[model samples]
Target chain A: KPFKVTVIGSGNWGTTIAKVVAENCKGYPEVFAPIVQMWVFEEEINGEKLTEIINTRHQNVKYLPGITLPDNLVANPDLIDSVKDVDIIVFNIPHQFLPRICSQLKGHVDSHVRAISCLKGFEVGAKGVQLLSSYITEELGIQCGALSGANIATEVAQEHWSETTVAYHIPKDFRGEGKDVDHKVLKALFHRPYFHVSVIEDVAGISICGALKNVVALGCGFVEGLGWGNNASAAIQRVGLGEIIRFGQMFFPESREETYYQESAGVADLITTCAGGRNVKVARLMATSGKDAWECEKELLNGQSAQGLITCKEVHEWLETCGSVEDFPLFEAVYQIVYNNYPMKNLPDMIEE
Target chain B: KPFKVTVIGSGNWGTTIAKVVAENCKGYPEVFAPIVQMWVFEEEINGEKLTEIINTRHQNVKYLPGITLPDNLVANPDLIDSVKDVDIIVFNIPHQFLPRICSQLKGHVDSHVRAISCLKGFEVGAKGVQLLSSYITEELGIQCGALSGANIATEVAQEHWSETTVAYHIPKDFRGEGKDVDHKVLKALFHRPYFHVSVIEDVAGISICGALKNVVALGCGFVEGLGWGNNASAAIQRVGLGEIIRFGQMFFPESREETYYQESAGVADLITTCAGGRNVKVARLMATSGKDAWECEKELLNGQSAQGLITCKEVHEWLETCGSVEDFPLFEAVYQIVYNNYPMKNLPDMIEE
Candidate 1:
């Protein structure tokens, strides 16, 4: 049997990765099953199954046109009871939902079954997703890893050819049986011609950059929404990276800056800020075009929540508390404009002063 | 009569600026008469008649496509001696020829007429244009001022909206009547409905920036020649500005680093480096497609010379002597690629290291 693997969530990113994995997964079992038994709670399992049947048969989805669903992947809630028997368990549920779900399913956790997280965005006042996952893993007695990058669904589904890097953090994750297993499994799970996977020991750095870029992207959107050209955008992006680096250094001085730098999350966010990104497009429209930011909330609600918007507010608050948004005012300025209606042009001058 | 001005060179920049000035010199005398005047070497009577004649006629120079020279501007070398009589003289000549020509006209130099230089490069030692100008001014007992900016001729000529910040080392010449003038004269001299000019105080900073941009543009072309896209270009450009800023800081430490920061020179270089600029276009073609640098030299001879190529060799030697490009490898690598024919692929490693 091709190595059987299961995904919990069937949302856009979840489905997108599953499709990509199905098409790219080599020497893996074509067997379709679910790992998280919690998936059985939803009456929508049949809906997901029907979508999978259409995906396998038509190589596409009804709601999303021109996007091919990967064949040979299935969703099942029954795998929850037998989760310990599986090689890997993946979670894509919301941050808050994960704790309760993991608590209930903690009995199924096994030493052999490695946990992987595809969700981003930290809970308010709750540190980070990695920390949160570590807490759950500690309680459940398992190990967890992260995959992060600028993962745009339509782009991935259409196979526009982009790469994202992910890494395992703990020292044990880098060597021996655990290391070899992760290397093989991650290589198998995330690897593909169009999809690339890499591992690094500095998991916090990568996770932080990935997490922070959204907030910065939201800020970039505000700048664009203000109709600033590429020069201003480039300036914002560079200074924003400087801000992230400073924050990362201030909070985690011992960690090297290079460890967390994600080209997709960092640079790609900049490129998309011009017009190609969802956050940028939505932010610019809402901030400058006199559209509603909440309108985007609705559209984003239909898709990926404006996680960056929340991140922007949070990050801006953090910076303001630290007494310096000078490094990246575009983010703070936009966050204020969205949250407090701060005018944008005054921003450049404000920074100058 | 409107203040008579003569454009010394018959190049694109000269021809374009003359047209622009003619349109802007509102109350100045109509000095475009075709009157001829004779001058003796070492003791020439700087006549106004020839300048009067050429001013009106040369604006219609048939050789320059369908471009009509500005009606108020004269293009004549006979006025070289008469430069003493004109209200203002604009030397838009190439840097290489400035000293020789300025020396030839030293006999006719007048202390009263305002002289402004628009060229950027300076040969090393006494061969430098600034040094040569200083020598000529001491001999003739006349002072000259300088102006530099990111002025593109075709864009300005076609009346596309553009703005450039002009700098004067000796601010007095730009302030009041002889003691200075305001945006009104600059507006009158360099402006159109679409082109705006702003005055700046850091003459050396601006000049160095304008001059070194060609070198950075060459660097930009090299990266583009490698098909690396803008990531490397932006990164290299950011780093190149650091080179220019550091070099400029060594020479003019009193000036603000922000005055000559990377955004101005490094970013501005992008404007001309990607086949959009004369010098960078030459460098790009020479580096990529296995074209010879001599071809670029030939093109320069045909029209405007490769300003960056010659400057690159000079600046590289200067940096080596100063031992700073050692500290700035982005520019060093590019200079080496252009001068030493280093393999391009190893560039990333060299730069990262």
Candidate 2:
């Protein structure tokens, strides 16, 4: 009665997730298969397919260099082959690609496969902003939750002490079949001595906390780039936090305000993201050098994109379409400074109450 | 028609308070007197009395060197003389000094004078822990609120952007005796273009946030000293925050959980403290060098006390008396490590849920 588990992405965080999940699943052999499949996009690295390198070396040499993954973490080049007969599917790819990926996985996967989004972002369309977890559920015909927190890939790979919140959503129609069992399975897969997980039912609350923290982190980077001291950086963060709380409460009616204070996916994640990360560094460079975020992303991240930059853009378009740009000054200022050539020095003034 | 303002305790933060209050009162000439008195402990700095040095040089050359205080900030050597007929008292000293100071000013000042505490600490006695503001109110027979945030004194003095939450206290008996004006005057004395003030009525909530944040910051320093990276530090902070909420909700019935997110004194202050400060640096050295917190304090702070060092001990005694050490694992671990010769490495395991 063991359930097969596969993660449909192969990035730094995705690899870290597979490493933790593969290691944790061993304690629950009756519930999870020993081997965990990770779908790696087909790419050739130094005359070898990336999946082959992972399969042979048991490490993600390109995206997450120097981290040795467990032997049970099997890398698959084909997405269809990765999730075949899988009971739990973890979606960790970029949010921008979810539409295409979900379309491909719509009918290919089994109906009972439970999904959880690891992407810290939202989808915007004609209707406005949509949580990626919601998108996964709607597109793939499955119950989708989310797992996120103040998690850094390399630190988690090193088995450093970290905590995260995993939300397990059970639709009203499927509550009787097995609800709390899904939550227990998630806790088993992610929770460890080094990685503690708080499994909750508010998928939207935890997911939104994960998504909006980037916009706030960019604000902190902006303050630091201006040589504003810790006080200013803290000031900017508090304002950004206020906006985040307001945004979540206003947009997602299901989002419990307590989640921001109680869950690791909320304030804990925000604190870590704002302190130091790829997005913070990118925004810091963007402000100090007066360069665009794209240039900084190119120079700093090698080939990876800054999550804050893309998330801010998505938020800006959604807000503008609703004529609510003025409501969120932090997000608006971040977007304008990054894309519209807005003066970066004027950001704090705009956010001042 | 203007009201008089005086500051008690001429430490770095106290001197900064006098400087800000004096300058701000100038704009509200009709509501506040231009001159501000600061009570100095009358210490000798290189043969000259400390108060004389401040009065002559327009700065606290010993405590806050190189910061040019306003000429209107008169340094008074005598405690009674400093608050003679003063309308407002700003308390910014070591919490250890507050009990004696409050006893001295018991019958000397009028009951109409409003007082505010800026100290981030709690007092422990036979009855257990008590908010310093409550202590002030009981000892001096005046309404006492609190002013606090992630404000570093030097940065605020340098006019860096910062935000603070000022909790206004109005006892049930004084509802009609010009209560709102007192709140307005507190705002006028502190609020500036750079120093944004958020005035609220939950003094216990804001004060508790300001007090307990140091203990959490010490936990972060311990993690960093163990060479646990950003993820671990973030994890420790969030766990500490949870305990803080629990402590507040369990002990203080007047505290509102929303204050932690809504007010700058709550989460904002916690963020700044855990990121970097005297508390963090002291704890960091204690964990790495295996030296006591007292030894690290002398080496790192240049004679100033580490607030967390005292606060944790106070909290431990208070919790132990109530038989609730098991409830707050982070605080208890910090106390045990610092004072009871507990292993620093075993700290996180105790906090793990």
Candidate 3:
């Protein structure tokens, strides 16, 4: 039986992943549906529907302009109808709406359906910290994994050579010879000549690295804005990663695998995110213009800065509840300066001396 | 007893280390000499003696201008007289002259003398690969450590905040309370408010990362010159570091510590070097202008491309001799493309796909 694939988002990264997935599906027609349904939230660009433009022109001109998407990728606007009867779901939407969407999909999809969260960040609730994949798995009763990399959506859309890591919730006895059903399915769905893919036995580490790196990127941005050289920026990155590694081991020790440090999901993703992410821009604006992250996000990103602010508060509150805020000096420094009105010029003071 | 300090070599970085050492000495006068002797190769610049200018102006006006040295930093022209009676040595000279300098100071310095190598690169001989710190320990029969980081000498001299790793040769029953004699002595000599110091127990890992990162920087420069984006560049760095880790474990398994991955000597140094090192510039010119590394180094850097070429050849030959060249595809790719007439555009093929 062939599995149907539905991509549930149409942002730049969403559209970009759909293009790769749709192109990759052609190589394995027996395992995947020929046409992939991409769920685009309805919007009007001029007079026509955004989904209609994507379907007719084979282009995501609004989100990923000047790039032609695969013709096999069909855009769907209805939340329920888009995922009906699909066996593989790619979650690439803004993480804030994940709870509501998962609630909408509860008991709607069968047990055979699995998900791979291309989304970044966690879902902190009354219970505690939770990976988005765990939330999806718990809410929808389906296996979920994660994929992250040094992938910029624009660069990936241009088909520049890049690598990504996909971690699956495999069976207990899974050998991972790139031949098991879970590994093969993921590789067939995403891997390409320009877009390389690898599998690891980590679910939380892969997802957490994608979110926590933006926190580090904010520190790098502050270093850049403070007129410090690359040496300072790199030091901030190193310390920030060290903190992330410590936090991951403390929170979810079982999920902390060596792949977290080796794969594209960890160091490579952190490198790329720090190089060109929204958090860096907002933090730079905060340092240079003396504006808080909220104001800077509104002014620069038009109220769309998600990972930096959300994860900073999420991780900070979790650490505070556990009486572990002091252990993470860089994270606490970012939260205090951005939200608590701590001085920006004194940011480097938090670095270990 | 106050330990007399001597700085060998007076290049830009050598001069920079002297400035920091002289300033740091003031804070630990009970443990360090107030007047530090810096051995400067005798030379004439514009009809004025270089050593005379450094002594009078307290500045290395030729190599490290615009930075004032501490008044107690004395410049000496003779090697034997410079190192005589010194209890500590800061080895920051070019690696080519290290053997001769070691022979010259073989029996001169007492057995109580300890050294820290700010020098990068290794010595490849008929036997195999060898760390410069190992060579120093063997030659002088003195304890040696390594200090490596995302440190650019000019930026460090300007007092930009940065962190570096110091890996010491600890006692067998080591209690790493940050108060061992070796660790405290190094911290006092190198650590400052802006210059954060971290001590590890893996001496070889720290020194090897300092040299190996330049080899990685060459790959990053090739990626940029080929017009690849940040994703590709970061992937190259990840793979390069992976190779370095593997090589470190294979050769010096006992010295491979997890702290090596977290310290400034490893990841942070790679970031800074890839961002702004001489090797990256020469490699970029190689890709864009279709010239080799030798010609580019000569034309651009005035025959000063030491780490990239020297270490690449050193590590490559060592791996080849062990019959394990295939284990390090990224290093071999760099060596082949830079020296063995391989095509530049096909460099990304080296990335593990």
Candidate 4:
């Protein structure tokens, strides 16, 4: 496994990044495979090759709208052996599933494997870097790097160009004892032309930003859901940022020094969860689908990239007993509607509050 | 005419106010009707009562809604008699009609009449308070008190709970023959249980807030126009407020000192404008209808208030070449579209930028 990077769970976002790396792994000169060792919830034949072919050829269909497979990026289910010693594991799965998937991968992976989890949400009852960190480290004794910001998958895949920040709780000296286990090796493999990655020492700053934006996005989404118009929506976003800044300031004091970080993160999530962002657009569809359980099911069908939902749930639950997060009505309402089973119809008023 | 208070240009706002004064002289007991005469473009009866049915029965309707008209609240189109012995002339005319009306009123009134024009836009080139003051003072030898804010006409008419603030550049000592007219007089008439009014001696503070919010509203309108949802809109509004505070501070050092005033007049206006404000809503219509001009004209025809269009024009124009009003892109885009003819198609981009 010479610089073999296994991006687990070959979803749209995961496959998109994999394609980018496969095409342009500059400093590392690496070849890309769809899933060197993916933990697919579903079974498929030769899932690795299948995923590579589908992902690579999917690029051609976009290149030539009516085209088919490139035979490179396709899925492979029969590749359990490949999971044994992959240099790096890129968990593209949702945050909730990461624990379940890692639990499975624990039996196969070498103890020293480094992982980058682009998952943006936390478990319903658990939160912060600790949620992912503790789970991954507990399961496989490995710290995972978190990725976020306005890096839309399609945009990144299309080479429209973008940059994202990555935060790893693993200390600078925590490079492990394996062939490609150094933090520098992982950093070297992750950098690319279209994908510029920066490292932040404060794990809370990055994680809080990731979680809060989704919560804020719920408010943004609700406003759009109600058709309050641009000014109203803009007001909501601005206020939402304020709420995030306050929340970040209170909970993650380390982030207060980086004044722009919260606003940027808040805005990033806002735009992403916005109808402007595909996942949110689709999630909004679920919300409007006219059923509670059905909508919940529909919402989850979106790979839970509707991070705002879970974030909202977590925030609301926290606020219920612990304390308030400034004027965070957006998430409060979202938390009510989605988790607390507050009638979805009340979302508008909830958002307005 | 010892109490020479002239309610200039008797229209719905002026006439309704005049009627309120005529009927209830106990509070605003000055017989400025004959002195507080109207100067109209033409002698057509506005017939406000017939044109609109402001339901006073609604709890939302304000305090002085159904006040009986005082005989002194006369609609004297004759400027000579109206401005003949008036001490203060209130200009309730539209922003566009200010110069023409003021120019004519100049000939009738002497410098003795402390012209308290209540008109609003102020970001340069705008026919609002700032420009209105200069013009009135230049033409009539008096810089009028520019009365402006989010107070609705029906709210004030019904005397439903309402509040307003006045910005006066004129000297408090110059309201009468060597007698200082207390700012309290203006507050007396404009303030009541149903109506609350505050006086700010700083012309920059009042005008700055009034003018800046339009840019924010315009940005809000642009977002709504694109149907982007509230998150981005909220972000823009929050930024707009930040810019307003920053720009206000830059313009007036005292502005930053008085953060409450900025939040009250400035931030309050942001909420008012983006909360489906007439001007921004018009922008929203234009953004979708492809008839931005027609919609604007329609609002003017329909007789609803829209402070943003002209204000945006004034602020953004200044922002484009001469100066910047902090970074209120909402105001900038709206102003650009209305005055600069920046094209409605580019509103979202303009706002985003």
Candidate 5:
């Protein structure tokens, strides 16, 4: 029997992921479900349900307005109904809603279901720090992998040429029999001509790069807002990259593949994120106009919290409790400036000789 | 006795190097000559000799206009007079002119006078390929090192905060002696408050990064000119970096330090060059306008040759003769597009799995 595939979100990135997956499903019909179900969180816009609009129009008219999704992809609003009998679930929702969604799906998903997370942030659970994929794996009792890269959702949806890295972890207790098979399946489900994909065995490192780079993007914004040129910005990014690499090795020691920091999911992702993320713009404004990040986000970003600000809080709390501030001077410095009223002029000293 | 420093070359980067060296001389009186002499290649611009204008007014009026250089920096027209009795030589001239200058300097300097090359790009010699620093050492019979980074000459001379990597090759035949002392003196000569410096032990890798990244910048420009987004550009750069590391390990076996792939000279420099270099701009125009790279360079860069095109030709010639095109698909793909009429639409195949 062919495995059923379902995408569990319909935001910008979620819609893009669905487009890629749906195209691949058509390409390899023997390997995937003919009708791929995509879960759209129920919302009403312009006197129509968002899911209904997507189903009829075959485009995410609200979030991803300009792109056309594949015809084989179907959008649904009922969460339980969307996931029924699904064999491969793609989790691409916001991090704050993951726990509740996982709890709602308990006793609903199939025992054979596997998952791939396109989510790009971490959570501060009852424990100090946890990856979102780890949360999904434990809560759903299913093996979960991750996909990330310099993938901007708009670009991917538009079918511009790009690449992403998919990371799968083989458990210590499981026989290493189907590990390569699993990677091949995951690659097929997401890879496309323009949206190229590569697979590696680094679950933790790949996901962490997507989360930690937002904080660094804030540093880039700070440099640009302070009227510094590309060299200064590149230096700040270099220091930020060093911290993330060190943090990954220290915090997520399970997967230390050097490509975890060199591939599409590593420096490439950091480059694209820092180049144009909302956090960079907000950080630049905060530096130049003497406004807080929250203020700028409200005024400029329509009050949506950037991942960098929240990441700074959670990571700072975790690091402070663990007493490892000195070990991560760049993270600490960014956290201090964003939260502790530290002087902004002293930012360069964090990377100073 | 303080080392009498002489800067060889008066191009844009050469003048900028002179500014930094002169400032450091004033800052560290005990370590350097008080009045450093910079060699200017005689040129007529606006009815005046370029060297005469620089000597009277502290600036390179032709190349780096609108920036005032330090008062202590003097300009000399005669090459022999510039190097007369100097204790330290700084080579920042064009790569094409290095051989002639070295031939003239034979038997004209102190044998103990050490040198540092700020020049980028390599030479294709009878032995296949060799670095400029290697050529300098062999020709002048003097110990030499190299400096490279994501540094833009204007930004560095403007005193914007930037970082550079200096690589010192310890002689295989000599003792472990003077290594620490050499690094300390080199650091003292270059490191400043705004211009941070780092030292490594891989001379070839550091210099190769400067030469090789230009070809990658062309790939990035092609992507941008094709109207692809940041993700595509970043992917091209990542693949380009992979090829460079492979080429470095394969060609220059002596300098295999992994930091050569991680430090300021490696990835940081690549990021900056691909982001804003002249090569990227010209490549973009070439892709969109269906013009050759040389034609675009002429129209856009005031008739200056983009180093990426020349480097691509030389590196491709060397790689093809060695039968390693498959090993460097990205580099080879770039050469095919720039030189062999490979369709620009198929550039993605370089990183395709």
Candidate 6:
């Protein structure tokens, strides 16, 4: 029997992913079942339920405005009800909400159900940083893979050409033991003409790079705000990418060095984040206006967090706790500038060595 | 005695590099001579000659206006005279002028003298594309290395931080071979607090990626003209970098796979070109204005050439002659759009696969 898929979030990325997944289901009917369910945490939009509007008008009017969701993709208000019939769950939401949502579905999700996370961040555990994919697997007792790269929501929803690096965990479930059906399922669900998917053997490399890129983007914005031109900005981006690779190598031995370069997540997503994005914008605002990151986020992002700010603090602490904070000068400078009031003018000097 | 150095070419990049080289000479006087000569193709500005003005004012007012060149760096009009006392020659001229310049210097310089090229293009020879560094080596009968990355001239001149990948062709000449002085000299002359130099072993890979990136930058501009967002643009950049690596691997036997990822030239230079640069700007102008490449160059670039425009044409023909043009869709699209009247709207599609 073909596997059923449901996207378990309703933010900008979630809605766009829902649209793509539903369309892919129709296109690859042999691998995926026809209808896709998107769990929308119910919100009232102008006296109407957001899920009701999505189900009726085939559009996500709130988060991903004006982009039409696929007709076969139904938006359900109740999270568990939406996920009940799903064989595959695509998890994409803010990193902060994962714990609560996963707690509610702790034992509910069947061991047979495969999951893939599109969320981008780390869980700062008591010891050190943890990859969100690993966290998902540990929390739910299921194999969870990852899809991460330069997938900016509105543009992706508009079907602009992009590429993503996907890493599917080795299937422990006995079904399709002889065949590589897990990889096939991921390719069918994520691959499109516009959205190219490249699968590698790495799970943590793609995941870490996805989260770490926002920190790099903020650095780019720092340079941009400081009137440092493209050369400096590109240099900062390059340095940040190097540090990302270094951290992945040091932390996750399973993370292959090539994934950061050959795959879409490493170089591609860093370019996406650094060249243009909300984190870059907010960081730029903070750099120029002498505003705190919180004020910058409030003024520019309209309630959305600049996760780079959070990542820098958490990543620095994580590294510091392990006595390796000094290794990454780029991340150190970013951490100091955002959380500790390091002179922003000295950002160049901090990373120069 | 310290080795003397001279910079050939006084264009935007040339002037900036001259300034940096002069500064580095002073900073590392134990290894390099305090004085540096920069060859200026003399031209009249108002009533005074360009060389005379630069010598008097310590600035290339015509090309890199407002930036102050170092006092120790003399602008010399006579090219052959500039090379007389120099042990090291830095070639930063336009690639079109290299053949004639090297021809003039042929059999003149000592065989022991070392050279490095900063020029970003290839010679479309009888067989295929010849790297500018290799071309320099063939014409001059001396060792030639390369320095390339996200070194935008003005920002670099302004001393905003940047990084470059330097590859010193293994010393075939025996002096100081055990000491590894070739790498030491490159680092001494090029490395600065603001300009971080990452030296690698692969010369051809760095050189090829440097030249190929301009072509990629133009593709980025095409998407910008078509209003493709950051995600699509980043994908294009990533694809172009991948092609750079592929071409190097396919054509150059000595090119290492890791240099493109680990060094500044490959990924860093690509970002610099695509994010903001003359080529990206001019190509964007070409796309939006519906103008020919030549017309766009004429209108936007004053009299300077967009080597990316030249690169796509030469690179395409070179690959086609070699029966490998079919391998690169991104390059094919760039060539078709720039030269053969391909639609701009389909750029995202051409590289989607």
The prediction achieving the highest lDDT against the true structure is: 6
Best by DockQ: 3
Q: List the candidate 6 regions with Cα displacement exceeding 4 Å.
A: A42-53, A61-65, A77-80, A177-180, B42-57, B60-65, B177-181
Q: Per-candidate TM vs. native?
A: 0.53, 0.92, 0.92, 0.54, 0.92, 0.93
lDDT, candidate 6, equals 0.83
Score each candidate by Cα lDDT.
0.54, 0.82, 0.82, 0.54, 0.82, 0.83
lDDT of 2 by residue, B51-165 (tens): 8887777878888988998778899989999999887889988866888898888899987777888877556633676788888888988878888887888888887778888
Sort order, DockQ high to low = 3, 2, 6, 5, 4, 1
Q: Show how many residue pairs clash in every candidate, following the order shown.
A: 24, 0, 0, 64, 0, 0
Angstrom error of the Cα, residue A15, model 5: value is 2.8
Interface RMSD of each: 7.5, 1.3, 1.2, 8.7, 1.3, 1.7
Worst lDDT window (10 residues) for model 2 chain A?
A172-181
- Sort candidate 5 into its docking category: medium
Please give the DockQ score of every candidate, comma-separated: 0.06, 0.70, 0.75, 0.07, 0.66, 0.67
TM for candidate 4 is 0.54
Alpha-carbon runs more than 4 Å astray in model 2:
A42-57, A61-71, A125-127, A175-180, A291-299, A340-343, B41-57, B125-127, B175-182, B340-343
- Please list the residue runs of candidate 4 whose C-alpha ends up more than 4 Å from where it truly belongs after superposition: A1-6, A21-90, A101-116, A123-145, A150-239, A257-264, A271-313, A323-353, B1-43, B46-353
- lDDT string, candidate 6, A166-198, tens digits: 888666564683233467677778887778888
Which candidate has the highest TM-score of all? 6
Local accuracy of candidate 5 as per-residue lDDT tens digits, A14-102: 98998888888888777777888999988888978888787777878889996987798899988899898887899989877898889
Question: Model 3 — TM-score against the truth?
Answer: 0.92
Give stretches of model 5 more than 4 Å off: A42-57, A124-127, A172-181, A340-343, B33-35, B41-86, B124-127, B172-181
The CA lDDT at B11 in model 3 is 92
The model with the greater TM-score, 1 or 3, is 3
